[model samples]
Target: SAGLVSLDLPLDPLWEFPRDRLVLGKPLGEGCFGQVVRAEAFGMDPARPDQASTVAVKMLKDNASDKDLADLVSEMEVMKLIGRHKNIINLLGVCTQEGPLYVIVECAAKGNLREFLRARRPPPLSFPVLVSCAYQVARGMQYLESRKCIHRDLAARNVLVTEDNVMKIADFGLARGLPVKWMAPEALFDRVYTHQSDVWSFGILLWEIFTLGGSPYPGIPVEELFSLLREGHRMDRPPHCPPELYGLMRECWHAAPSQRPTFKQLVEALDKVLLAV
Candidate 1:
């Protein structure tokens, strides 16, 4: 009889990218660090049988710094840590090479929320949908808070929708582990973002949802927005936002981080909003 031996197995295959199979289409979007391209991941989604699934390929641009490389590594680690949460974007994997650093992610058919709202022309979301999205967002935030992660960039543009109108949070580029900006005034100057800062961002996101995708601070210049924020100026409650929801948003945007409600509290408050709906 032979003794049994165990061998470690890789969860997913790490393969050299197939350069010849590349069929690039129009550019999806561009940022300072990378350009996103719309592409098909061959044999990537076997479960969806009828047709090949669309995927977004984010390729690192030239001149990317070591810091940028580190950030990409961090993003990969964070995505793996969070795994496949319903309200979080799904990361397929990444390809790191000398020339190209590519991240493969699920492509949202409707694109970012800002573009979705501009194209759909939907009326202000009914209280049901609003609360539903809010609940989902709170759930996502709760998960992050549990892990001591704070999403520094929580905005409408970072939220994407599915065909059925379910919302998912995307873009973890600025996320950090706690001591976030939240309601801290020092955050404005120090660039220190926190979970409380995320709450503040959530309030702004709520305002965007209530206004049916209006731009944050519609007419204000970016410099002016920051200046006003520094001077204690904040967005006025939208007329269409539910009173209770508005109050909760106010609490989230409170000047002091300690006064901001926890994710659990937000979930409870949103439950009340849902009941009223």
Candidate 2:
């Protein structure tokens, strides 16, 4: 599934990187539709192979076929269009010329935020740092919202933690099994996703953060989630979460999409909370 073959993906020639330059290393992890591997790309700027820059490569399953490649290319276009932001994962390059199309992005040293929080627990990452993470995520989402990009996947698992505990929103446009637990009622029922739907997931993400990576609705099964949410049931405030922050989270979970605060509003609100905390 590796080697040169364009697969007819319409993209800027600048992003079309050499297939041989990427030396794949050990598997980092797996997305629902693709496998992410740690890799080093040689001669990205120049010099010897020893100067290879480390990166993460996302390659769709070998059997994903044409439609998946189409999706991958579209994602590439979106990434290129959105450009770079501190809190959003940056697309370094792409190897669509290869038989199995590869999407290269900057590596996140600490891995996904979900596991990072779970592993470190509290003292390792203070409450202030946690609040900053929420703030950073909102900043990233605000940027995406400005670009009119809807992050179909927005959850703790989709957020990556880099150096200095920075948060990077990731997994854009990647095919994944439905995340019903993180979804808004409208998104789950109508298959509709908007910036507002992303807001709802952000609320769930706040729960994940304040709970120190605890799963949302801890004991409740997925089967009963929709009905419970439909009945206006929302997650209770976590033990250590500040009432103000929890209140903001509840506001993000407002039943009416329009009632939910936009990412811009979340950013402003979180900024105030971050300073106070």
Candidate 3:
């Protein structure tokens, strides 16, 4: 009864992708159980091989167990449940008949937000770009909240940036630690998470955006973060972060989840911040 779960994904033709059409290329992310890699999948829209669509495919390693494949299938189910959105990674298709199980999704040409921010220090992304990043994330999260999906893990690392500078929320792990630094106090201690708790994570994400992917809590060790937060401690304003923007971040970290601004509110607030800068 504890942590043992089963899933039954729909047997729909719409998502039945042809295995031969996939050509694995660069590795996006790899793990012992499986990997996420960039691949070219043909027949995306009108079933044409001439036009190849670059996508990321998740697959269990050769030695993976049956349960591992099942877990991947479960994640695919969650992706189908969430459906499509501009700022959310779209599930392109799935190949789950007899051979290597493949779960394909749109590839973020730019990469995750953390790497994107850290790699661009020389030309420092403009303040407007930073604010826009925050606004876009809030917009994406607002959509998730409306759909009753809790990201559970919302961090700079989980947010992917596109070549066009758009941000999309990916990796619906839907479970993780209070993830320490990005976690709200209640989640860190009480083991509770909701959309509002995600709002807390959004606050930390804003810190990451403004700080150019700097680690949260700065000098304070993870061991000390909980106690300090218990005493109402939060990160100070980043070097060039506007006072109002910092105020928004502070609002998101509010101890009471109810007091935290909803993603909808964040989108509206960031819109106002956007006009000024």
lDDT of 2 by residue, 1-277 (tens): 2222354554557777788878899999966766789998886655464577888887877677666666666666678878999998889888764366788988898989889999997457788988898899999889888887788858998899886678999976444435778988889999788999999999999999888898888786688888888898888987977787789989988989999998888898888887786
Candidate 3: list runs displaced more than 4 Å. 1-11, 47-49, 173-178
Model 2: runs farther than 4 Å from truth?
Answer: 1-11, 31-33, 45-50, 98-100, 175-177
The TM-score of candidate 1 is 0.79
Ranking by TM-score, best first?
3, 2, 1
The local distance difference test score of each candidate is: 0.68, 0.82, 0.81
For candidate 3, list the clashing residue pairs, or say none: none
Better of 1 and 2 by lDDT: 2
Position 90, candidate 2: lDDT: 87
TM-score of model 2 relative to the true fold? Answer: 0.89
Residue 88 in model 3: lDDT: 90
> Across residues 114-176, which tens digit of lDDT does each residue of candidate 3 receive?
999999896568889999998998988888888877887689989998889999988763334
Q: Which stretches of candidate 1 lie over 4 Å from their true place?
A: 1-24, 46-51, 97-99, 122-125, 173-184, 221-233
For model 1, residues 43-76, the per-residue Cα lDDT tens digits are 5654663455677776667786756655665675
Worst 10 contiguous positions by lDDT, candidate 3 = 1-10
